[PDB]
Design a protein around this ligand. Structure first.
Ligand SMILES: *[C@@H]1O[C@H](CO)[C@@H](O)[C@H](O)[C@H]1NC(C)=O
Ligand SMILES: [Ca+2]
Lengths: 216, 219
């Protein structure tokens, strides 16, 4: 099952995904649609049956249509009035299975709902507070805030500090992505030696380096 | 609308353990044309869900003997006789009996390990950020186990909820721990109306909460 659709739709607008089926006939089998929101479990949206009728999840029935073309083996997912919380991976699938052969899923189509223009991140270095205690290990941070779209690349001293890094999944709020990165190093290496956050954002072709300096 | 309740939510296991996941429906999962449509799906990170069991008890093609399914009516159970590392992921049941069809909430199968307290680090807003008219306070809670944890922000002795965004990693494939970042974002002006900022973490490893804080005064 091959899917095609837009990675990006704007809030009030519509979303169409195409699912091209092969190996079985749509005259024989239903095709279902499922999605997964970023923090969340799988959710069933609807089905188009072999006979051409449809059923839907009641939270979506008023703004969702599944349609098909039996001759070209296409199934279409059309949904209106998208909102930021419709950002998800959308799958087409065979389900309600009766036998092993023909139980395929699509790859999934990532759909992101946002009004924002391509926007580079504000990168902020995070040194510890002035009174924070020092042990063998000191933790520093990087805040990559207000960017669009995904992804960004966060390295520390150009990759050399890989071990000891945590980079956290970005979360989407008010049309923009924000993420966080922490690196943990021996107190004998900072602030004595320089530690730097390197942030790359391919979509805006920006590359930004940000030294972690103590607050004086 | 049929509610599917999976339990437990989280199942820690050591490799080689027997494991049982339970799925209870709010209505009888009745047959359709002689078929009882109860199915189990596994999702590993970065991948599509994949069918394991269909029609309640039938192993799908390419699915090992160690996986079995049983049950009827409103009680169903997936069993793994001896857990391998390839089985770690989230398991979802699905019912195809009653429209609209519904998944359970999922059960996360995870690797058991020795308890580990979070390393908590708190960070005042960057100066560079205050210049733009925003202020974000950031707390890291790194390398803890088990996954169960509560994070509470306190400003001047008051629990604060608005402006808080959380984000977590899945289980680390090196050390089997979890990490988390919590980020309280306010306007510059609201941030300046206060002094004591605190990130409080409740976790199994500590009888009383792990606390880190600063005074804006000092930075
Ligand atoms: C999603 O957000 C929209 C827009 O604010 C709102 O109408 C809707 O109730 C929300 N639904 C869910 C499930 O979060
Ligand atoms: Ca119907």
């Amino acid at each position: 099952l091959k899917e095609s659709g837009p990675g990006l739709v704007q809030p009030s607008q519509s979303l169409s995904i195409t699912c091209t089926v092969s190996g079985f006939s749509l005259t024989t089998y239903g095709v279902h649609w499922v999605r997964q929101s970023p923090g969340k479990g799988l959710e069933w949206l609807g089905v188009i049956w072999s006979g051409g009728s449809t059923d839907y999840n009641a939270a979506f029935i008023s703004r969702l249509s599944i349609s098909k073309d039996n001759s070209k083996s296409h199934v279409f997912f059309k949904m209106n009035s998208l909102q930021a919380n419709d950002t998800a991976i959308y799958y087409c699938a065979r389900m309600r299975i009766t036998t092993d052969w023909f139980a395929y899923w699509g790859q999934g189509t990532l759909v992101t709902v946002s009004a924002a223009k391509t926007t580079p991140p504000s990168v902020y270095p995070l040194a510890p507070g002035s009174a924070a205690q020092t042990n063998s290990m000191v933790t520093l941070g990087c805040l990559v805030k207000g960017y669009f779209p995904e992804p960004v690349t966060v390295t520390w001293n150009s990759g050399s500090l890989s071990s000891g890094v945590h980079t956290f999944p970005a979360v989407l709020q008010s049309d923009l992505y924000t993420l966080s990165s922490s690196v943990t190093v021996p107190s004998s290496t900072w602030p004595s030696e320089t530690v730097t956050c390197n942030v790359a954002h391919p979509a805006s072709s920006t590359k930004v380096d940000k030294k972690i300096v103590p607050r004086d | 609308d049929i509610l599917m309740n999976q339990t437990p939510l989280s199942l820690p296991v050591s490799l080689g353990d027997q494991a049982s996941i339970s799925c209870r429906s709010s209505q009888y999962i009745v047959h359709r044309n002689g078929n009882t449509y109860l199915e189990w799906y596994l999702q590993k990170p970065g991948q599509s869900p994949k069918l394991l069991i269909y029609k309640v008890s039938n192993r799908f093609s390419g699915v090992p003997d160690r996986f079995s399914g049983s049950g009827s009516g409103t009680d169903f159970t997936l069993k793994i006789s001896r857990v391998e590392a390839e089985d770690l992921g989230v398991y979802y049941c699905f019912q195809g009996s009653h429209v609209p069809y519904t998944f359970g909430g999922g059960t996360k199968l995870e690797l058991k390990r020795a308890d580990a307290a979070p390393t908590v680090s708190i960070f005042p807003p960057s100066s560079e950020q205050l210049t733009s008219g925003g202020a974000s306070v950031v707390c890291f809670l790194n390398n803890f186990y088990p996954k169960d944890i509560n994070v509470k922000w306190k400003i001047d002795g008051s629990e604060r909820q608005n402006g808080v965004l959380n984000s977590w990693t899945d289980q680390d494939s090196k050390d089997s721990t979890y990490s988390m970042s919590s980020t309280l974002t306010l306007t510059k002006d609201e941030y300046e109306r206060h002094n004591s900022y605190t990130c409080e973490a409740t976790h199994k490893t500590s009888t009383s909460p792990i606390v880190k804080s600063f005074n804006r005064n000092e930075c």
